[PDB]
mmCIF file of C-alpha atoms in Angstrom:
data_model
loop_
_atom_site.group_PDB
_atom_site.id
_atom_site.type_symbol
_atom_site.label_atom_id
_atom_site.label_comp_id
_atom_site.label_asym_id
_atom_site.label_seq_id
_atom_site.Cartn_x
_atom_site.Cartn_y
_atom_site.Cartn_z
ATOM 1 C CA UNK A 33 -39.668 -181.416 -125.145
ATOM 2 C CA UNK A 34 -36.912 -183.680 -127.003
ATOM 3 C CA UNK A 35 -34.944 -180.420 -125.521
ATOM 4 C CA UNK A 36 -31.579 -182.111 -125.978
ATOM 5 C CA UNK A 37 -31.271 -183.918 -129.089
ATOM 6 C CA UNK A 38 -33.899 -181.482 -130.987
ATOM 7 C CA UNK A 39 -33.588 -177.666 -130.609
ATOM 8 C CA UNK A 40 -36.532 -176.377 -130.601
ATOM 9 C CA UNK A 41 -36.739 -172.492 -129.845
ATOM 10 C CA UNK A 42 -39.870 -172.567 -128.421
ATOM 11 C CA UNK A 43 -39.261 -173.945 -124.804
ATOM 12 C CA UNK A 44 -39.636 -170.367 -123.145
ATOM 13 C CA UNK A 45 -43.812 -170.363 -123.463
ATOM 14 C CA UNK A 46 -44.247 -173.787 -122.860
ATOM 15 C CA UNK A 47 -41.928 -173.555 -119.707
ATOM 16 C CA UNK A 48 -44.168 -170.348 -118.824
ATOM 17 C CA UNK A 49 -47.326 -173.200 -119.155
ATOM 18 C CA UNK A 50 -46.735 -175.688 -116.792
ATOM 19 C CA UNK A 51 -43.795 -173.727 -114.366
ATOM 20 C CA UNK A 52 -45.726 -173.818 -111.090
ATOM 21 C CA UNK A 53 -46.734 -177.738 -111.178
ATOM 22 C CA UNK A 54 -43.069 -178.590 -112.060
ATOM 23 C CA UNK A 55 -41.888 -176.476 -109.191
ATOM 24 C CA UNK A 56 -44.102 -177.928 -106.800
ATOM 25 C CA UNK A 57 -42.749 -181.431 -107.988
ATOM 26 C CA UNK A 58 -39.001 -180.480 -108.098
ATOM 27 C CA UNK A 59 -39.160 -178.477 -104.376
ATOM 28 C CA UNK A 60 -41.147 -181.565 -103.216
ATOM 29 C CA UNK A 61 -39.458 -184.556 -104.676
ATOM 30 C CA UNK A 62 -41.826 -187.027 -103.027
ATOM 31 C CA UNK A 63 -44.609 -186.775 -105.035
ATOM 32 C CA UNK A 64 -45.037 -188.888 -108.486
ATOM 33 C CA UNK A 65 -48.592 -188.416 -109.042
ATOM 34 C CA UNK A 66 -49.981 -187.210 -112.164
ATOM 35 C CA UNK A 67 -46.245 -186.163 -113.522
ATOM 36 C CA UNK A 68 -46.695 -188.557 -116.643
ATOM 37 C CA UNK A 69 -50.011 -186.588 -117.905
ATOM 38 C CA UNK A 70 -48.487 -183.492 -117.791
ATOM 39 C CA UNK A 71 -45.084 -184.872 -119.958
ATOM 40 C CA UNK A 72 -47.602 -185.914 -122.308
ATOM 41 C CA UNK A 73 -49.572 -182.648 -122.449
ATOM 42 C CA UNK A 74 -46.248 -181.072 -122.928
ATOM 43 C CA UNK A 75 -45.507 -182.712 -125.539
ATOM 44 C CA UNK A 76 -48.492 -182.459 -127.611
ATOM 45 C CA UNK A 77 -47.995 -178.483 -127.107
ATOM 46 C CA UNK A 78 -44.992 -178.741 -128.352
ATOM 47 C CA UNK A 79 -45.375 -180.877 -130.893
ATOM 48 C CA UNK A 80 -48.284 -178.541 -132.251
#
């Protein structure tokens, strides 16, 4: 999201579009599979 240098106010929706699969990778901090795909498809969304 470039959330920190850039402030984009948009970050509510796109939080709302991937919340579950982040959860399920924060709450269970083993798992690295497929987390780069979905940075990228976040930022394409936002991007757009």
């Amino acid at each position: 999201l470039d959330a920190f240098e850039h402030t984009c106010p948009t970050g509510r929706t796109i939080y709302d579009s991937v919340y579950n699969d982040l959860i399920n990778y924060l709450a269970s901090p083993d798992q690295t599979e497929g987390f780069d795909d979905l940075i990228k498809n976040c930022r394409e969304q936002h991007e757009a």
